[PDB]
Design an enzyme around this catalytic site. Sequence first.
Site, PDB file in Angstrom:
ATOM      1  N   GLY A   1       0.800  -1.207   0.000  1.00 30.51           N
ATOM      2  CA  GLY A   1       0.000   0.000   0.000  1.00 30.51           C
ATOM      3  C   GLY A   1       0.833   1.257   0.000  1.00 30.51           C
TER       4      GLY A   1
ATOM      5  CG  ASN B   1      -7.474   2.552  11.470  1.00 29.82           C
ATOM      6  OD1 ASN B   1      -7.349   1.795  12.432  1.00 29.82           O
ATOM      7  ND2 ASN B   1      -6.978   3.783  11.457  1.00 29.82           N
TER       8      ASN B   1
ATOM      9  CG  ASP C   1      -4.121   5.379  19.478  1.00 26.54           C
ATOM     10  OD1 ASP C   1      -4.731   6.247  18.820  1.00 26.54           O
ATOM     11  OD2 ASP C   1      -4.422   4.166  19.446  1.00 26.54           O
TER      12      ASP C   1
ATOM     13  CG  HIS D   1      -5.490   2.316  16.399  1.00 24.61           C
ATOM     14  ND1 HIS D   1      -4.708   3.260  17.029  1.00 24.61           N
ATOM     15  CD2 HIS D   1      -5.374   2.556  15.072  1.00 24.61           C
ATOM     16  CE1 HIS D   1      -4.139   4.034  16.121  1.00 24.61           C
ATOM     17  NE2 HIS D   1      -4.528   3.629  14.926  1.00 24.61           N
TER      18      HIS D   1
ATOM     19  CG  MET E   1      -1.219   6.181   9.849  1.00 22.90           C
ATOM     20  SD  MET E   1      -1.572   5.540  11.497  1.00 22.90           S
ATOM     21  CE  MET E   1      -0.163   4.467  11.765  1.00 22.90           C
TER      22      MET E   1
HETATM   23 AG   LIG Z   1      -3.663   4.530  12.797  1.00 20.55          AG
END
Ligand SMILES: [Ag+]
Length: 300
Positions: free
Chosen positions: A7, A108, A139, A166, A216
């Site tokens: 990805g 996610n 996080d 998460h 991210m």
């Molecule tokens: Ag994430």
Amino acid sequence: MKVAVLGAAGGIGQALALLLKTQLPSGSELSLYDIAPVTPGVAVDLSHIPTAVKIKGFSGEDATPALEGADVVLISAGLFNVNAGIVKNLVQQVAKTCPKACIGIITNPVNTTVAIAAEVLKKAGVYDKNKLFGVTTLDIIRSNTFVAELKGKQPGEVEVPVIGGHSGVTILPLLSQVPGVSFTEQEVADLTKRIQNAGTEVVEAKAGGGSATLSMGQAAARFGLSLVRALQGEQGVVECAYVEGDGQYARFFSQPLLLGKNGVEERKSIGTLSAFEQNALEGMLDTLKKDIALGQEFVN
Ligand SMILES: [Ag+]
Ligand SMILES: [Ag+]
Ligand SMILES: [Ag+]
Ligand SMILES: [Ag+]
Ligand SMILES: [Ag+]
Ligand SMILES: [Ag+]
Ligand SMILES: [Ag+]
């Protein structure tokens, strides 16, 4: 030590590949894969940066050339059924190719996609619970930022333990464990509310332009680098990640982890929890268990 990014053409993937190209240890290798035909040119682009990290890019529907020899596989490809089917397909591809490799799921919902990957690796008979990670590092670095700003600390010197899941109420930052810093009951609730809703902070600010991509990629890069360092043999590397542990609270659960040359070396205890944290933990276990079951049923 070779890292495969599945990805790599998306927003998260390109930021992750840039940081890995520039921060991976000398002698590392980096393979980029994505269905987008631009992916081989993304690697050539990064190949012009003068670091000792060989990089090659691949496209098409077959990721196996990018997966050969991979020691770490980071999956950030990617409405839920589309993303769930993408995670299942790519993990099935990894199980055919590199059954050893540590696998970090970034896609996610992490609470669900990791359970998807686990049931897939089980069906291929190659599942090792010490080698599958849900990347929850975003996080942590968010909690570090918010705590440092509130308490006037240097953001690089704050480390907040974050356990659980998460998403939403499953993210529990353990503010009572930050050394040298104390919080009021109002500050704990407020910080917890912002940390659990930080993804929506970005979505609203992007005015429909998407969710978090750059931070991210930074968080995934931090976790990948810690994994790579531990796989090289470095000692005392501790990161939090969503993994299948003892199941004391849920089948999968984010907790401190001592990393080693085979992935997880020891699942460290979450420690002492305040009344607010113990109550937030038991109040979200139902949602977390349902998140896990959703991924278990998607495969089975
Ligand atoms: Ag994430
Ligand atoms: Ag391999
Ligand atoms: Ag292999
Ligand atoms: Ag490995
Ligand atoms: Ag491993
Ligand atoms: Ag943590
Ligand atoms: Ag941690």
